[PDB]
Design a protein around this ligand. Structure first.
Ligand SMILES: C[C@H](O)C(=O)NCc1cccc(-n2ncc(-c3cc4cnccc4[nH]3)c2O)c1
Ligand SMILES: [Ca+2]
Lengths: 247, 56
């Protein structure tokens, strides 16, 4: 995250850190005790699918404070329509091997109904994006969880104000090079507040971090609600990676 | 009251029905109050609330 602030410990309790061989891979969002939403592209180069770990309740990567909960990733589910190394349909649903325990420091973000998200949430101007990604373009990653308030653009406006955005994406942020999500943040939440509760509206995708004349690109979670809900009702299948039909 | 406008007055989710009818609903871990619009937690750690802030 470029140009944000430290998320005070416990204030982003849905944030997930994904590790592979102990190394930072991506972020994610907890939506239930066993389900995490992340970005498909995070998994483009995974060799050993068995070595993927999700950590909840993380804050400061330099220390252990006892609020962290680590789980093995049992399933990584990716839409059929996602093509590795691209941006469209950049979403993954991860099943944890064992539920996390909800605590003051570990709480799911609400996955909204599609109608609500489209009719109401899509019109809330500002939303929060968070992660342990790069603090600067071509810079070091963060040791403490960072958060940033970004405004959402209608796609027409995005295109105009920009110095390929599909219906499965949206733009948010700033064009002045001061504030953005960055490498290391992908998969993390774009969270939207409405009447006292927070909801998942986007996933940090990719494409150029805090580049002048460009906005951040996020996966438009509303397009995937039904897809996600169906999968969460399904039994696990052997083998970690599952490609599931979309729609 | 239509769901498309002002969320139908619902705190959370809204469904249109046949006629001048609307029903609000709440996410799991919440229940709907008698006002027919408000949602109140039913569990300790409802989704989308921040415990340290809810406590202060
Ligand atoms: C063949 C290459 O090794 C490969 O593709 N590996 C897969 C793989 C895994 C995990 C992460 C990444 N990865 N690389 C770059 C970005 C990224 C840039 C960016 C700008 N603004 C906002 C979010 C952003 N994210 C990113 O998330 C890539
Ligand atoms: Ca820690």
């Amino acid at each position: 995250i470029v140009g944000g602030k430290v998320c005070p410990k416990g204030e982003c309790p849905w944030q997930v850190l994904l590790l592979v061989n102990g190394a930072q891979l991506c972020g994610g969002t907890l939506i239930n005790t066993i389900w995490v939403v992340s970005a498909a592209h995070c998994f483009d180069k995974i060799k050993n699918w068995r070595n993927l770990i999700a950590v909840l309740g993380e804050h400061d990567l330099s220390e252990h404070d006892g609020d962290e909960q680590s789980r093995r990733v049992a399933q990584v589910i990716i839409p059929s329509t996602y093509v590795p190394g691209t941006t469209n349909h950049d979403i993954a649903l991860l099943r944890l091997h064992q539920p996390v325990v909800l605590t003051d420091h570990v709480v799911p973000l609400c996955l909204p109904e599609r109608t609500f998200s489209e009719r109401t949430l899509a019109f809330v101007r500002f939303s929060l994006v968070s992660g342990w990604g790069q603090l600067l373009d071509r810079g070091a990653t963060a040791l403490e969880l960072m958060v940033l308030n970004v405004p959402r653009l209608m796609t027409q406006d995005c295109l105009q104000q920009s110095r390929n955005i599909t219906e499965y994406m949206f733009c948010a942020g700033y064009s002045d090079g001061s504030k953005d999500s960055c490498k290391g943040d992908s998969g993390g939440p774009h969270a939207t507040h409405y009447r006292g509760t927070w909801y998942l509206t986007g996933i940090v995708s990719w494409g150029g971090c805090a580049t002048v004349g460009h906005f951040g690109v996020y996966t438009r979670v509303s397009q995937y609600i039904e897809w996600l809900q169906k999968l969460m009702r399904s039994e696990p299948r052997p083998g970690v990676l599952l490609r599931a039909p979309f729609p | 009251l239509i769901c498309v406008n002002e969320n139908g007055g619902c705190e959370q989710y809204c469904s249109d029905h046949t006629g001048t009818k609307r029903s609000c609903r709440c996410h799991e871990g919440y229940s709907l109050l008698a006002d027919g619009v408000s949602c109140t937690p039913t569990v300790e750690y409802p989704c989308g609330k921040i415990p340290i802030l809810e406590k202060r």
